[PDB]
Amino acid sequence: GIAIAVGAMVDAAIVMIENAHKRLEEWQHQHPDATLDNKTRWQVITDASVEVGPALFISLLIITLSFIPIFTLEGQEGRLFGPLAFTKTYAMAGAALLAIV
Amino acid sequence: IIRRSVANRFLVLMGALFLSIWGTWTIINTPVDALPDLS
Amino acid sequence: LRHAIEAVPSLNNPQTFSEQKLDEALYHGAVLRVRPKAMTVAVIIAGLLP
């Protein structure tokens, strides 16, 4: 369950990371290079994280919930795919809580 | 919501510095096996 | 692309008989996003390959 969730859970951490780069790419072309501090740099980071943030959270939040139904599985086959569904759901629900905090 | 977490930015690190140390501990302790009991 | 369509051509719609106008936002909605887009599908499939 973990091995499967990994690729999914990192990709939602990066979407913010490749983007902040771009909101730091923006301030470059706009203003002066070789100078910036915390106030402007952490705000552009906070800004970078909030516009495309929730949709990534919802994307991940949409992923975890959508897979849940395989908990519906019964008897023997369910005991098998039980832990696969938990661990996956935890990792997504893990990275999700991680991407925000 | 994200903006609250960044506020107390040290509470998230210290929280995290534990989520990893403690998790690492309960990772090395987690019992092994091949398949969830299926019987 | 739903974002780049509100923002740039939203103001440039009142003109009737003007579709080539809107296509600009769509093209744009596909360029900056590819760097991320490829990169997610990149990992989504990358780490799911082993």
Curated annotation (Swiss-Prot), chain A:
Result when mutating E18Q: Loss of copper resistance
Highest taxon listed in the record's lineage: Bacteria
Transmembrane segments: 1-17, 52-72
Annotated localization: Cell inner membrane
Upregulating conditions: Transcriptionally regulated by CusR in response to copper and silver ions.
Mutation effect (D11N): Loss of copper resistance
Protein family: Belongs to the resistance-nodulation-cell division (RND) (TC 2.A.6) family.
Name of the protein in question: Cation efflux system protein CusA
Source organism: Escherichia coli (strain K12)
Gene that produces this protein: cusA
Full protein segment contained here: 395 to 495 of 1047
